[PDB]
Amino acid sequence: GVGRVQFRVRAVIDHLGMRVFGVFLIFLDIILMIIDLSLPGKSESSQSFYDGMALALSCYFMLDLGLRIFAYGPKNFFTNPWEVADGLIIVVTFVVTIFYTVLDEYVQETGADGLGELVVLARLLRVVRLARIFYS
Amino acid sequence: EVQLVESGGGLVQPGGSLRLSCAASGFNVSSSSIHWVRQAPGKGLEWVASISSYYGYTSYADSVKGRFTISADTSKNTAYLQMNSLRAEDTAVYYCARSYSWSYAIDYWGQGTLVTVSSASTKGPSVFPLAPSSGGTAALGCLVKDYFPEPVTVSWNSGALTSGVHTFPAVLQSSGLYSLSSVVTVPSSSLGTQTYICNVNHKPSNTKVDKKVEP
């Protein structure tokens, strides 16, 4: 009753195949970003496509996170800094990406300033992600 | 306590050079963005340059690229605009301004410094009285005539008299020299009793004239 499924999810989440394919998605996400930043004068149609692919990935990491929080339970997952870090990072990156790609008409209602720097911040956090993996 | 005090503007010949400076108080130039924005007389605003020292990041408008250079001395908390190969079209009020960083809105501007690019020579003004005619409200003033370049300041009674004062925008003329009037309305009963002096200051020519205006 709960702790059971919370066990099957980990029996998948833990696995090397999903530990690695999630690592492969991180490289993919960065590669994407480089291409996106290197193509001169791409149309809005093309931009929507690269924005779509960044959001797709960002959403995946959001689910992965919502299970590693569900698979060890909130209380237990929260304690490890090397995990809360990674999760915070995932969220921040997702919020930036969601507004960039989907909710931009409504960005003024956040009252946020320094949009350009928040975007740059979010791109760097995707690289910082691997700087946690490197210790493992 | 935020302040931006700019200096270094003035008359310069086409091809010549000028260095403006912006003294910052109340925040660190080293971690903020500094901007220069210019305004040609009777025109809009044109961004000229930016430095965000924290990123080793400067940026320029194409209209000044190669000729202007922006920089900062973090120890003096001061920014600089080096301006070379100046042209007629570079004539403007140059404002220093700051934002929290490069992707943030500019939130404070200094009062700016006027840059005049011209081959014409500096010339001090002649000052002439506009004497009052013969309760009651009288008008009197002074006419500040034949000067270059802008701009002249006029005060009345060393600044003590401000109420009823209108100092008019300079007009150009055919000579290529400016001319203006400053007028004040006073109680006609004060004439003969109260002394009225216009204090004219034309910095470019180091001219300082005080004119007693009387019936």
Place this chain on the structure above:
Amino acid sequence: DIQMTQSPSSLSASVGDRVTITCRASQSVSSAVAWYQQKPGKAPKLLIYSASSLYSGVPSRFSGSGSGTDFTLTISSLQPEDFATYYCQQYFYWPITFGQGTKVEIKRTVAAPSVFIFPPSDEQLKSGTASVVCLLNNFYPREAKVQWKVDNALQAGNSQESVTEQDSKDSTYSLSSTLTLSKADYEKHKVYACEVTHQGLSSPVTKSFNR
């Protein structure tokens, strides 16, 4: 090279009126638009940042909104100190660009000018030139016509006008017209007059002097 197309280029409205200024960005800039108020001879001041956030200490009468690439500054209760030029600005792309500005004039009740004429001083006459000044003081609206006459001959081509900006308390203007003559032409004539036409004057007023 983002173009900010701002309209109207100028407007005139009464105290208490709702005023709207529109800016259209040539392409999307997210919410990186700021609005600035520049009063005459002063540096601009920030009113609104991020399209719709009010900058600290600015009166709430100023609000910003946007829809897509369309940006609106609204002054919802025009105050007489609101006479100024307003500029939108995008700061999302390099280079930062401004709209051409909107000149806001405060509409008040008609006030006729007080008219004063000043003969040239003797001091100036030693220089060989004679400036004759006509002063129109504290009137509204801004439109006014000054006509110089010298012994009833109507002068053309030898005068220059200058107008102050709108006062910030009483919202009026003042105007100065200078007639310029050689000393020789000045001393060939007796009657010097300026005739002022203005809405607040039921018929044109003349001030004159002799010599």
